[PDB]
Amino acid sequence: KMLKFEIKARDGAGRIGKLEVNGKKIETPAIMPVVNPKQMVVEPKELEKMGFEIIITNSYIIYKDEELRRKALELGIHRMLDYNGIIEVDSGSFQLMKYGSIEVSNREIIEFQHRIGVDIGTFLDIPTPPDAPREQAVKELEITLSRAREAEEIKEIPMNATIQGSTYTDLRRYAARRLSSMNFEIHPIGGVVPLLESYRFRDVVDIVISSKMALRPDRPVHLFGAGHPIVFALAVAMGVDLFDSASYALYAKDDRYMTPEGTKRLDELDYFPCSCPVCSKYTPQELREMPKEERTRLLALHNLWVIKEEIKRVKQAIKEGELWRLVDERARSHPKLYSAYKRLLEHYTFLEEFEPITKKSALFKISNESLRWPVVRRAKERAKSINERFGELVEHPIFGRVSRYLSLTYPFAQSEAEDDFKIEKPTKEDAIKYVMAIAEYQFGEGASRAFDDAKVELSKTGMPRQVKVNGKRLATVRADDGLLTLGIEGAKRLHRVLPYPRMRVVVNKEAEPFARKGKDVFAKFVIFADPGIRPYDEVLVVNENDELLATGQALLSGREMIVFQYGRAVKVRKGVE
Amino acid sequence: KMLKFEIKARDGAGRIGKLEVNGKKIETPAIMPVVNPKQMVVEPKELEKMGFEIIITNSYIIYKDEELRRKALELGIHRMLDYNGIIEVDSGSFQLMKYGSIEVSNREIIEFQHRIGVDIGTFLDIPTPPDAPREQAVKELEITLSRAREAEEIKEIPMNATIQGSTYTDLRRYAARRLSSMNFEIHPIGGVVPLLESYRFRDVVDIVISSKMALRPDRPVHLFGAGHPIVFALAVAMGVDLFDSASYALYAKDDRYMTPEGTKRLDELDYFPCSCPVCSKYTPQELREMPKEERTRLLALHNLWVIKEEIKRVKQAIKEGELWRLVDERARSHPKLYSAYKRLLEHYTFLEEFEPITKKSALFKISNESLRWPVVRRAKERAKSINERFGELVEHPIFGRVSRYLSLTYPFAQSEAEDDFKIEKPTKEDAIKYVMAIAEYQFGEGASRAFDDAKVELSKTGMPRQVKVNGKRLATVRADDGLLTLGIEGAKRLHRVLPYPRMRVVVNKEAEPFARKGKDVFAKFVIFADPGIRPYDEVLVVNENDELLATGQALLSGREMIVFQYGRAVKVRKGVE
Ligand SMILES: Nc1nc2[nH]cnc2c(=O)[nH]1
Ligand SMILES: [Mg+2]
Ligand SMILES: [Mg+2]
Ligand SMILES: [Zn+2]
Ligand SMILES: [Zn+2]
């Protein structure tokens, strides 16, 4: 294990992760600028100063140039580029996609990558073009897989194992499942460059989702060639963690200027809709008259700033549970991106497994699409049975109508549309009915039976809070989302009222003592867990004998908990000890 | 004539304008930072260095303070504030909002503003709150207008005549009519601060449109209190040319960070979604540790950069003919903004009057609301008749079905949605049918009768270009928009086929010679024009006797050509004499 990856925060199918490679730590989503070893528009040391702690170069281009190879073998790529962050390197597969044949063998560049002290390498995977004869897509993929097995045998460093299969979702699934069973640390998704250039974002969505579906969750995903800000928000919402960009430099040499919404020709710019170091002091009409070398430099820097800025924007949105809103905003950039956005939302089943149970932000109805967001479709179905049971429905701008008993609970209460939703507070005789409704809603069918005989306390306002029964607190309704926070007593009740494995996270014999003491539960110790658990659900920490050890909040889905070996699986609230 | 205002470019009902006062020019849309004479987070000279060439201060406050009072009379605000740009001042009406009455008379402040060398003054209009009872909306408006009448009498400086009818569109209309008929140079729209602070943007749209409907198009409109980047694109699209902001500073004082999509609390920021001098330099945490004063300063500056940046973004979009696409993107920032955006599109009649006829940018189907854009509804309606005659209905992504004869013309041809639309090139036999369908579509019913007996000469590609008869070239189908550019001969024919005033722009007797000569028609010399004329339409430059003087392209709407006293109204292609 030379590569460690763990989730720190999440939204949609996206996540902010901590990625460690042989001692170097980087936060994802992240973009690695592509550096041309022959003509570096922006010096690696300057990229590093700008905050780019990971970059990529062409080991093949280096290998072929006598001078470059000599220096790379003499000082290592790090000293050669005078860069200290993570240096990822490509294999020359891109030259393969352009010329068909390359003058170096898979084993050869791999060994070369090792010789120059590369942080992360890549083998000669074949980038089958889109809409290619299924025959070619298969023949090429098998070679890719063969070259992969070879790389798995000789690699001594972290390496990229790229998924191919052209535009055939079944080949994608196959590639993903196969490379997922091999010893590799990162899984790029290739062959998409031509799609991105053509703005065929819908096809990329299909390729990306089919790949993510078959890929094991705990490994970072890299979208090869997605180096333009316009796709960041969407790609990250699908679960992409890494991006690489050469366009920042190539566009600059073409007097092309990037924007989160697309690209513009410098000669069509009357104003700079940006405030970066470059745009804050210069002007379109000035830049246009500068020496090309200078014009290229300033554009490159600008492009890098906008790319860096989008990433930060995306991470900040994930942090506040607003990614979908941002994605919705960026979808209006281009008709094709809008097409791709609608398509992504059709994949409710894939998206639903990762969609957090509760978010910081309120549900915003800002378009027709938002009514199709994962959280909306989930709350709809989960409320159906709660309505035909508790009745007393009220009107809701977004969900139409929902029982007054869920009106204080996310996302019904925690949402906003064109018109405002009037939440109906409980009564002294009503309270418990709410707690029961929430339980049945948050924990599933039967959960109320753990609270029936309880007494709900009300705050200075008519809001439900502390839930008690013949003593100790069973749980508490949160003010922030109207969801229940389990106390050890309430956890015990749920445990006996709900059959195994509902709400369970089964831990290591070794992990048992810690959970009992209330320490947090770490993924590597989770041997099994309820497949229904969603990020942020209340959870029952248990041993194999299903004995309650503690209660806490999930940070991963049931499945992820099993698969993941790094990061916390559960944030424990209280233990049995 | 103490204020000149010219339209330099436009889109939607918005416009980029040239505003001159005291020989000081400024480009609009423009936002004026509100400056507090007592406390200044950022100082006028700094604001001037940042590029804010217009600001606003509270003359009443300056008045009520001995210190400022002396220095003001003594030095005159310009030197007092060490600012050399346009300085606008407010009456003290703001204090009226929160105090209901002040210790100064309409006449007193007005004369005081005159004494301190103010570039633009304001009288004591009463900012009636959003949903006041009708008797109050009415009472205060009459009081406002009496002060308007007094101000018009003694005025010796350009002044803001604020439209003030609360939330009664009929009162706004009246209020606008009256002030328009009076001698003032700028028209703010007031009583909206309470609405903006409550994100009640839909109500602001209704108030603005009802005001704009009754305002003289040639005068600048100012949305009083609209100082957050969130409403700019929307507001500009409604024809608002000026904004003032106090928020950039006040928000900073409460560690609130501005964004084109809204507002963020500093203690809730993990990353800065911006590249400005501040954000590209510091991190959220680095900011939180600084002393309150430094924090307030840096945040205030950041807010100013966001403001400045959105404006440049809005102006760039107008120049590109993509304002609506931006409004749409921005509509996704908040449910209340989305509600307002949809409402704005309900006001088709108002918007269509100012909406240009042809654009450089292609029509993008990026949302549901995209289908309700002015250009789309206009195209649908107009084409109905063409589809009824020339038939040959071909499929279209946005309009569904449309006669093939218009498939070469804007906005049908370039249009792009989830799937591209393929154009139908003419046959040497259908050629004429196209020129006729286009004419009927571009010039209105009957227009075709001016081209029936003509031959359409196709180019290197099966595209129609020059239209000739007997040897004289009537017009020529443009390659870019598929719209006809008239030739003096085509002009003549249309002149007799279409009943006055269709396509007519009537000029002075003094302008008659130039027009005949071929010179461009300036607005001030236009006495009357076809209400149906839209920006960029082909127009018939005629004299009062309806005698053809020349042909050209409109740069304003017919209604605008009449009221406007500055700028060109028609770019003449060719005179007659
Ligand atoms: N290895 C590799 N590099 C790429 N660069 C762009 N696309 C690809 C791809 O599919 N694979
Ligand atoms: Mg595990
Ligand atoms: Mg005129
Ligand atoms: Zn920039
Ligand atoms: Zn900033």
- Separation of alpha carbons A127 and A93, rounded Å: 7
Considering only CB atoms, which chain A residues are within 8 Å of B331? 366
Phi, psi of B538 (to 5 degrees): -85, 135
Annotated catalytic residue B90: yes
Phi, psi of B202 (to 5 degrees): -60, -40
> In 3D, which of A577, A492, A481 has the Cα closest to residue A536?
A481
Cis geometry, peptide bond prior to residue A29 (ω within 30 degrees of 0): yes
Q: Specify the DSSP class assigned to residue B215.
A: S
CA B298 to chain centre: 32
For residue A94 and ligand 1, the question of a CB distance below 6 A is answered with yes
Under 8 Å between Cβ of B31 and B245: yes
- Asked if the C-beta of B334 comes within 8 angstroms of chain A's C-beta atoms, the answer is yes
CA distances in angstroms from A95 to A98, A126, A139, B289, B359, listed in the order given: 5, 10, 19, 49, 41
Residue A420 assigned to a binding site: no
- Separation of alpha carbons B564 and A544, rounded Å: 84
* Residue of minimum CA distance from atom 9 in ligand 1: A190
- CA–centroid distance, residue A188 to ligand 2 (Å): 23
For residue A224 and ligand 1, the question of a CB distance below 6 A is answered with yes
- Separation of alpha carbons A211 and A190, rounded Å: 10
Tokens of B26: 């400024």
Binding site as annotated, residues of B for substrate: 125, 191
> In 3D, which of B309, B227, B323 has the Cα closest to residue B13?
B323
Ligand 1: atom nearest CA of A164 is 10
- Separation of alpha carbons B168 and B172, rounded Å: 6
- CA–centroid distance, residue A90 to ligand 1 (Å): 8
- Separation of alpha carbons A431 and A456, rounded Å: 6
For residue A130 and ligand 1, the question of a CB distance below 6 A is answered with no
Residue window 200-219, chain B: list those with CB within 8 Å of chain A.
202
Tokens of A160: 């990229």
Judgement on whether residues B481 and B520 belong to the same structural domain of the protein: no
Under 8 Å between Cβ of A541 and A550: yes
Identity of the amino acid at B98: K
- Separation of alpha carbons A330 and B329, rounded Å: 7
Count Cβ atoms below 10 Å from residue B461 Cβ, excluding itself: 8
Tokens of A463: 């809001």
Count Cβ atoms below 10 Å from residue A395 Cβ, excluding itself: 11
The set of residues, in sequence order, having a beta carbon less than 8 Å from that of B153 and lying 6+ positions away, is none
**Looking at the CA of B283, which ligand is closest?**
5
The nearest CA of chain B is from the CA of A415 a distance in Å of 9
The set of residues, in sequence order, having a beta carbon less than 8 Å from that of B459 and lying 6+ positions away, is B465
Strands A484-486 and A504-507: unpaired
The best mutation among A91, A93, A221, A250 to test binding of ligand 1, ranked by most ligand atoms within 8 Å of the C-beta, falls on A93
Strands A221-223 and A242-245: parallel
* Residue of minimum CA distance from atom 1 in ligand 1: A93
Residue window 244-263, chain A: list those with CB within 8 Å of chain B.
261
Q: Specify the DSSP class assigned to residue B519.
A: P
Q: Which domain holds residue B361?
A: 356-425
Q: Which of A499, A517, A533 is the last residue of a domain?
A: A499
Judgement on whether residues B123 and B143 belong to the same structural domain of the protein: yes
Q: Which of A380, A407, A425 is the last residue of a domain?
A: A425
CA distances in angstroms from A261 to A205, A232, A233, A373, listed in the order given: 18, 11, 11, 22
The set of residues, in sequence order, having a beta carbon less than 8 Å from that of A151 and lying 6+ positions away, is A106, A110, A123, A159, A161
Judgement on whether residues B57 and B79 belong to the same structural domain of the protein: yes
CA A242 to chain centre: 10
Considering only CB atoms, which chain B residues are within 8 Å of A274? 275, 309
Phi, psi of A531 (to 5 degrees): -70, -10
- Asked if the C-beta of A366 comes within 8 angstroms of chain B's C-beta atoms, the answer is yes
For residue A225 and ligand 1, the question of a CB distance below 6 A is answered with yes
What count of CB pairs under 8 Å joins A to B? 118
Residue A191 assigned to a binding site: yes
Q: Which of A268, A306, A338 sits opposite B366 (nearest CB)?
A: A338
Task: Please give the tally of structural domains in chain A.
Answer: 4
Angle B180-B181-B186 from CA coordinates, rounded to 5°: 35
Under 8 Å between Cβ of A451 and A467: yes
Under 8 Å between Cβ of B475 and B482: no
Q: Which of B261, B305, B365 sits opposite A335 (nearest CB)?
A: B365
Instruction: Output the CA torsion sign for A398, A402, A406, A408.
Output: positive
Residue window 385-424, chain B: list those with CB within 8 Å of chain A.
416-419
Residue window 294-333, chain B: list those with CB within 8 Å of chain A.
305-306, 308-309, 312-313, 315-316, 319-320, 325, 328-333
CATH number for the domain that contains residue B360: 3.90.1020.10
Q: Which of A469, A499, A529 is the last residue of a domain?
A: A499
Judgement on whether residues A392 and A443 belong to the same structural domain of the protein: no
Judgement on whether residues A298 and A403 belong to the same structural domain of the protein: no
Cβ distance of B275 and A276 shorter than 8 Å: yes
CB burial string A282-310: b at 16+ within 10 A, e below: eebeebeeeeeeebbbbbbbbbbbbbbbb
State which residue of chain A sits closest to B313, comparing Cα positions.
Answer: A273
Judgement on whether residues B436 and B389 belong to the same structural domain of the protein: no
3-state helix, strand, coil in chain B (%, to 5): 40, 20, 35
> In 3D, which of B313, B319, B230 has the Cα closest to residue B11?
B319
- Asked if the C-beta of A365 comes within 8 angstroms of chain B's C-beta atoms, the answer is yes
Phi, psi of B318 (to 5 degrees): -65, -45
Judgement on whether residues A510 and A550 belong to the same structural domain of the protein: yes
Tokens 């990558």, located at residue: A113
SS3 A527: strand
Which of B316, B324, B325, B359 is the best substitution to test chain A (most A C-beta atoms within 10 A)? Answer: B316
Radius of gyration of chain B (CA): 26
Please tell me the number of Cα atoms within 13 Å of B298 on its side-chain side.
22
State which residue of chain A sits closest to B336, comparing Cα positions.
Answer: A418
Considering only CB atoms, which chain B residues are within 8 Å of A418? 202, 335-336, 338-339, 342
Judgement on whether residues A274 and A308 belong to the same structural domain of the protein: yes
According to DSSP, the residues that pair with B473 across neighbouring strands are B468
The set of residues, in sequence order, having a beta carbon less than 8 Å from that of B358 and lying 6+ positions away, is B410, B480, B481, B483, B536
CA distances in angstroms from A249 to A296, B59, B361, listed in the order given: 8, 51, 26
SS3 B471: coil
Query: What angle in degrees, to the nearest 10, is found between the helix axes of B292-320 and B323-331?
Result: 140
According to DSSP, the residues that pair with B485 across neighbouring strands are B476
Which of A11, A271, A274 is the best substitution to test chain B (most B C-beta atoms within 10 A)? Answer: A271
CB burial string B483-506: b at 16+ within 10 A, e below: bbbbbbbbbbbbbebbeebbbbbb
SS3 A473: strand
* Residue of minimum CA distance from atom 11 in ligand 1: A190
Which of B8, B272, B280, B414 is the best substitution to test chain A (most A C-beta atoms within 10 A)? Answer: B280
The nearest CA of chain B is from the CA of A508 a distance in Å of 34
- Separation of alpha carbons A552 and A488, rounded Å: 9
Tokens of B538: 């082909």
- Separation of alpha carbons B305 and A272, rounded Å: 12
- Separation of alpha carbons B453 and B462, rounded Å: 20
The nearest CA of chain A is from the CA of B249 a distance in Å of 19
Identity of the amino acid at B157: I
Ramachandran region of residue B76, left (φ > 0), alpha (ψ -120 to 50) or beta?
A: left
CATH number for the domain that contains residue B568: 2.30.130.10
For residue A193 and ligand 1, the question of a CB distance below 6 A is answered with yes
SS3 A54: strand
SS3 A385: helix
Considering only CB atoms, which chain B residues are within 8 Å of A419? 339
Judgement on whether residues A491 and A524 belong to the same structural domain of the protein: no
Under 8 Å between Cβ of A60 and A90: yes
Count Cβ atoms below 10 Å from residue A500 Cβ, excluding itself: 12
Residues bordering ligand 4, an ion, CB closer than 5 Å: A 274, 276, 278-279, 302
CB burial string A96-132: b at 16+ within 10 A, e below: bbeeeebebebeebbebbeebbbbbbbbbbbbbbbeb
Tokens of B520: 């461009």
Instruction: Output the CA torsion sign for B482, B485, B490, B494.
Output: positive
- Separation of alpha carbons A333 and A338, rounded Å: 7
Judgement on whether residues B519 and B529 belong to the same structural domain of the protein: yes
Judgement on whether residues A318 and A365 belong to the same structural domain of the protein: no
CATH number for the domain that contains residue A263: 3.20.20.105
Q: What was the experiment behind these coordinates?
A: X-ray
Cβ distance of A335 and B416 shorter than 8 Å: yes
SS3 A401: strand
> In 3D, which of B213, B224, B236, B220 has the Cα closest to residue B189?
B224
Cβ distance of A367 and B367 shorter than 8 Å: yes
- CA–centroid distance, residue B305 to ligand 5 (Å): 6
Instruction: Write the DSSP string, B123-190.
Output: -------TT--HHHHHHHHHHHHHHHHHHHHH--S-EE--B--TT-HHHHHHHHHHHHHSS-SBEEE-
- Asked if the C-beta of A430 comes within 8 angstroms of chain B's C-beta atoms, the answer is no
Question: H-helix or E-strand containing A169?
Answer: helix A169-180
CATH number for the domain that contains residue B480: 3.10.450.90
* Residue of minimum CA distance from atom 4 in ligand 1: A94
Judgement on whether residues B397 and B511 belong to the same structural domain of the protein: no
Which position among A11, A65, A90, A218 bears the catalytic label? A90
Under 8 Å between Cβ of B470 and B557: no
Query: What angle in degrees, to the nearest 10, is found between the helix axes of B374-389 and B431-443?
Result: 130
Phi, psi of A237 (to 5 degrees): -65, -20
- Separation of alpha carbons B451 and B435, rounded Å: 7
The set of residues, in sequence order, having a beta carbon less than 8 Å from that of B203 and lying 6+ positions away, is B130, B167, B195
Residue A276 assigned to a binding site: yes
Under 8 Å between Cβ of B438 and B429: no
